[PDB]
Amino acid sequence: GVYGALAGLYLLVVPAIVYAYLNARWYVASSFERAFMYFLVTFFFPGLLLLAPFINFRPQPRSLNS
Amino acid sequence: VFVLSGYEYFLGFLIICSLVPVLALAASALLRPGAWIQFNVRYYMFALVFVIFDVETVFLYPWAVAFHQLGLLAFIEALIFIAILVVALVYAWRKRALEW
Amino acid sequence: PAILNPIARPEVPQELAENIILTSLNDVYDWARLSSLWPLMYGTACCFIEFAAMIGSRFDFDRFGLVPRNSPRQADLIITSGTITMKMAPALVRLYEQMPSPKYVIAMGACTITGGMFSSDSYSAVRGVDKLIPVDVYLPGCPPRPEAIMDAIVKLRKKIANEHINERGNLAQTHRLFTAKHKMKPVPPILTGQYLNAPSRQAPPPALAAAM
């Protein structure tokens, strides 16, 4: 086990990229992108479990233009 | 003398997986606040056919591991063991043993 | 006197003090209970279809975290879904007694709040299920919409997060037992388990089949 060089590549910096990827294309992704989407969560799961209560996917408040 | 290799971690892993329920049920212990079954002889009958066939599997595991270093005469002899215990299997279907 | 049905003053001081860490480990306790409370699959009357529609596709039940479990030992939440009569009254308090100790009943529909249309004259409906079990969240409507039942769960998640970890002594029932000996004559039971092979169906009785 690497102390802090290769561990942070798996635990922190790459799962933070997937959470940006998970927010953007999850409901609008195609039939091929969705099956690849479930693989990165089933692989970076001890990474994505750490930065779980820091990011909230709640929708942005609307502007009420009417 | 102990010439088995690979069993040094088996005694440690036997204790730690045994410490998975006894410590978690104790970790929960500090955080928490006309009776008839009918005698149907099929629970015995499904288990008898297991014992006759859990023993057949044990007898074929030295054969299967040491097969490709034995030859054909040890395959004719090991075919008698399988072909007889097939007749034990046809006897169980036909005599309604494992019917449920 | 002065006040009918008075409120007893809290003489206990409620010294509920803790540091930051024990209220940080209390946030994990309260979050993990409100977010995954499993409902009992209970339903009697018309307000079960309103709740069974929420299990399905158009409204997701298991989106707040509610996986329905059909036995009172695994489940904790129980949505009182439909009219309770005089029968099904002790079959419901038996359903409530056999649950692990943070239970949180919610009421549902106008019939478990007051006995909605069966308050005026019905000879067997328990008017409101708070006569039987303590309810956490009420919910009127006849039936409530399946958008409105997920509102009462939203109000219930506001009730779990208030709950304190060291106030778990009131989550266990008390024992104010008494014992009296009666002089009632015991009777044999009425409903034994025989319908077809009862010896009253196989033949018509005498002195009545002559004119039959």
């Binding site: - | - | 006040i3 007893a8 009420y138 104010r176 008494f178 014992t179 009632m184 015991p186």
Partner: protein
Amino acid sequence: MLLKSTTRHVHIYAGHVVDGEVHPDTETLTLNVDPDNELEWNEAALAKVEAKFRELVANAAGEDLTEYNLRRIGSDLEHFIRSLLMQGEIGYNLNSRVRNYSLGIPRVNHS
């Protein structure tokens, strides 16, 4: 069979309690008032209902052993427990995690 009557403030069973596991008898009746603690009791009114519990078992000791008769007693205890509240003897609990006030609201006497 364990005939019983389980209301909210009253749990009349037909049998005597031997350390949690109730055994059904033919002679005795167990009663525990307020298993959930909604009303904050005191020393006197836990003994006042014994003047109504042992009265109602003795006065109705000529009828059958049905759950209609165990309910008919319990519907008179829970109408005596309310008459304690409308006389102001006992009061509601405030440590209780639920606050539905099932026996009416607190109200003042004559405006």
